[PDB]
Design an enzyme around this catalytic site. Structure first.
Site, PDB file in Angstrom:
ATOM      1  CE  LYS A  36      -3.704   2.221   2.880  1.00  0.00           C
ATOM      2  NZ  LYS A  36      -4.731   1.900   3.944  1.00  0.00           N
ATOM      3  CD  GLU A  85      -4.033 -11.809   5.329  1.00  0.00           C
ATOM      4  OE1 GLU A  85      -4.132 -11.091   6.352  1.00  0.00           O
ATOM      5  OE2 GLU A  85      -4.746 -12.823   5.125  1.00  0.00           O
ATOM      6  CE1 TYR A  86      -3.783 -10.521  -4.263  1.00  0.00           C
ATOM      7  CE2 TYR A  86      -2.714 -12.660  -4.116  1.00  0.00           C
ATOM      8  CZ  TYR A  86      -3.535 -11.784  -4.779  1.00  0.00           C
ATOM      9  OH  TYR A  86      -4.110 -12.181  -5.955  1.00  0.00           O
ATOM     10  CB  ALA A  87      -7.362  -9.820   0.293  1.00  0.00           C
ATOM     11  CG  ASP A 130     -13.495   4.105   6.848  1.00  0.00           C
ATOM     12  OD1 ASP A 130     -14.513   4.654   6.362  1.00  0.00           O
ATOM     13  OD2 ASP A 130     -12.432   3.973   6.191  1.00  0.00           O
ATOM     14  CD  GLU A 134     -16.027   1.605  -0.607  1.00  0.00           C
ATOM     15  OE1 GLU A 134     -15.679   2.806  -0.443  1.00  0.00           O
ATOM     16  OE2 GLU A 134     -17.056   1.072  -0.084  1.00  0.00           O
ATOM     17  CG  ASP A 148      -8.779   1.933   5.013  1.00  0.00           C
ATOM     18  OD1 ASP A 148      -7.847   2.579   5.546  1.00  0.00           O
ATOM     19  OD2 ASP A 148      -9.597   2.449   4.211  1.00  0.00           O
TER      20      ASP A 148
HETATM   21  N1  ADP Z   1      -4.197  -6.257   1.108  1.00  0.00           N
HETATM   22  C1  ADP Z   1      -4.936  -6.042  -0.014  1.00  0.00           C
HETATM   23  N2  ADP Z   1      -5.177  -7.022  -0.929  1.00  0.00           N
HETATM   24  C2  ADP Z   1      -5.913  -6.800  -2.040  1.00  0.00           C
HETATM   25  N3  ADP Z   1      -6.458  -5.599  -2.340  1.00  0.00           N
HETATM   26  C3  ADP Z   1      -6.292  -4.539  -1.505  1.00  0.00           C
HETATM   27  C4  ADP Z   1      -5.507  -4.711  -0.273  1.00  0.00           C
HETATM   28  N4  ADP Z   1      -5.499  -3.524   0.364  1.00  0.00           N
HETATM   29  C5  ADP Z   1      -6.208  -2.659  -0.396  1.00  0.00           C
HETATM   30  N5  ADP Z   1      -6.684  -3.264  -1.508  1.00  0.00           N
HETATM   31  C6  ADP Z   1      -7.495  -2.601  -2.561  1.00  0.00           C
HETATM   32  O1  ADP Z   1      -7.088  -1.228  -2.581  1.00  0.00           O
HETATM   33  C7  ADP Z   1      -8.144  -0.367  -2.126  1.00  0.00           C
HETATM   34  C8  ADP Z   1      -7.626   0.771  -1.235  1.00  0.00           C
HETATM   35  O2  ADP Z   1      -6.950   0.265  -0.081  1.00  0.00           O
HETATM   36  P1  ADP Z   1      -7.155   0.943   1.378  1.00  0.00           P
HETATM   37  O3  ADP Z   1      -6.151   0.240   2.266  1.00  0.00           O
HETATM   38  O4  ADP Z   1      -8.609   0.988   1.757  1.00  0.00           O
HETATM   39  O5  ADP Z   1      -6.710   2.462   1.066  1.00  0.00           O
HETATM   40  P2  ADP Z   1      -7.281   3.811   1.739  1.00  0.00           P
HETATM   41  O6  ADP Z   1      -6.670   3.762   3.124  1.00  0.00           O
HETATM   42  O7  ADP Z   1      -6.755   4.922   0.869  1.00  0.00           O
HETATM   43  O8  ADP Z   1      -8.783   3.712   1.667  1.00  0.00           O
HETATM   44  C9  ADP Z   1      -9.120  -1.286  -1.418  1.00  0.00           C
HETATM   45  O9  ADP Z   1     -10.451  -0.763  -1.481  1.00  0.00           O
HETATM   46  C10 ADP Z   1      -8.962  -2.568  -2.211  1.00  0.00           C
HETATM   47  O10 ADP Z   1      -9.611  -2.391  -3.466  1.00  0.00           O
HETATM   48 MG    MG Z   2      -7.317   4.659   4.980  1.00  0.00          MG
HETATM   49 MG    MG Z   3     -10.068   2.225   2.184  1.00  0.00          MG
END
Ligand code: ADP
Ligand code: MG
Ligand code: MG
Ligand code: CL
Ligand code: CL
Ligand code: CL
Ligand code: CL
EC number: 2.7.11.1
Length: 265
Positions: A36, A85-87, A130, A134, A148
């Site tokens: 990220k 961790e990758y989802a 939150d 998403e 998040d």
């Molecule tokens: N560990 C992850 N594995 C797969 N997709 C992810 C992962 N983290 C984030 N994503 C994708 O990226 C988007 C934004 O990540 P997020 O951590 O929510 O960022 P923000 O803090 O800016 O909202 C998520 O809504 C999802 O689509």
């Molecule tokens: Mg955030």
């Molecule tokens: Mg987010």
């Protein structure tokens, strides 16, 4: 410890307001994970360095199958990289786009996993605040994982940071800047249960103002296809007065939940 050079970056997994998330593989181990990426100047400008700190502290130490692991971080004078961790199965948000509406088994299973994760959080007085589709990710067996944790705090709490996006998932006390606690995540669970079954959130509207009004007055109605058991759980969760919202244990043992969930409390 780690630096950018230790990783081969791959396809974009998604984008948030601040996060730009990428698939990545660590060169030595070949370990696949998610990076990220955050822009320091964007964090400073909006003044959310505390959110980034919060996310690292909370997610690196929480350990639960329905909560996304944060492994570590590094930085380079322009950006910060969180190693997550990758989802592999994406987000509940995407899945809702794909299917439009979830059946009752899928909905109750997600609500159960959510409630198990939140029960673990709340035992430490960590409230997420939150919860929205998403930020709900899917593991390799399709199990929901909460991600998040930047907005998370220890209860009780006020709100100091500006609300930027939709109000759809937030309770009256949170929007109005009042003191709040664990019960905020219970309200959000109610919003999610409704959205899962209907395909859109219950207080959805065309403007921020209209949305705020609908939330503070708790104005929602059910389409004909929502069953009585679902209506009951959702009505119990979406109470203006937080103290009237049920305990997570009551959600987990709700008859509509126990009859439709494929996973146990
Ligand atoms: N560990 C992850 N594995 C797969 N997709 C992810 C992962 N983290 C984030 N994503 C994708 O990226 C988007 C934004 O990540 P997020 O951590 O929510 O960022 P923000 O803090 O800016 O909202 C998520 O809504 C999802 O689509
Ligand atoms: Mg955030
Ligand atoms: Mg987010
Ligand atoms: Cl390892
Ligand atoms: Cl506070
Ligand atoms: Cl805050
Ligand atoms: Cl409980």
């Amino acid at each position: 410890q780690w630096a950018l050079e230790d990783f081969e970056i791959g396809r974009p997994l998604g984008k948030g307001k601040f996060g730009n998330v990428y698939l990545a593989r660590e060169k030595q181990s070949k370990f696949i994970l998610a990076l990220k990426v955050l822009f320091k100047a964007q964090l400073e400008k909006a003044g959310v360095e505390h959110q980034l700190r919060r996310e690292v502290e909370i997610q690196s130490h929480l350990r639960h199958p329905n909560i996304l692991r944060l492994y570590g971080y590094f930085h380079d004078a322009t950006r910060v990289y969180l190693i997550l961790e990758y989802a592999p199965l994406g987000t509940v948000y995407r899945e809702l786009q794909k299917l439009s509406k979830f059946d009752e088994q899928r909905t109750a299973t997600y609500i159960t996993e959510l409630a198990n994760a939140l029960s673990y959080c709340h035992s430490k007085r960590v409230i997420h605040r939150d919860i929205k589709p998403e930020n709900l990710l899917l593991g390799s067996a399709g199990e929901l994982k909460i991600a998040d944790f930047g907005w998370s705090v220890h209860a009780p709490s006020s709100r100091r940071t500006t609300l930027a996006g939709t109000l759809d998932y937030l309770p009256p006390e949170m929007i109005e800047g009042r003191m709040h606690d664990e019960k905020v995540d219970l309200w959000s669970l109610g919003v999610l249960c409704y959205e899962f079954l209907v395909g859109k959130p219950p207080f959805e509207a065309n403007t921020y103002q209209e949305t705020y009004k609908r939330i503070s007055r708790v104005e929602f109605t059910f389409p004909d296809f929502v069953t009585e058991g679902a209506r009951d759980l959702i009505s119990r969760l979406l109470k203006h007065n937080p103290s009237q919202r049920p305990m997570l244990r009551e959600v987990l043992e709700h008859p509509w939940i126990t009859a439709n969930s494929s996973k146990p409390s």
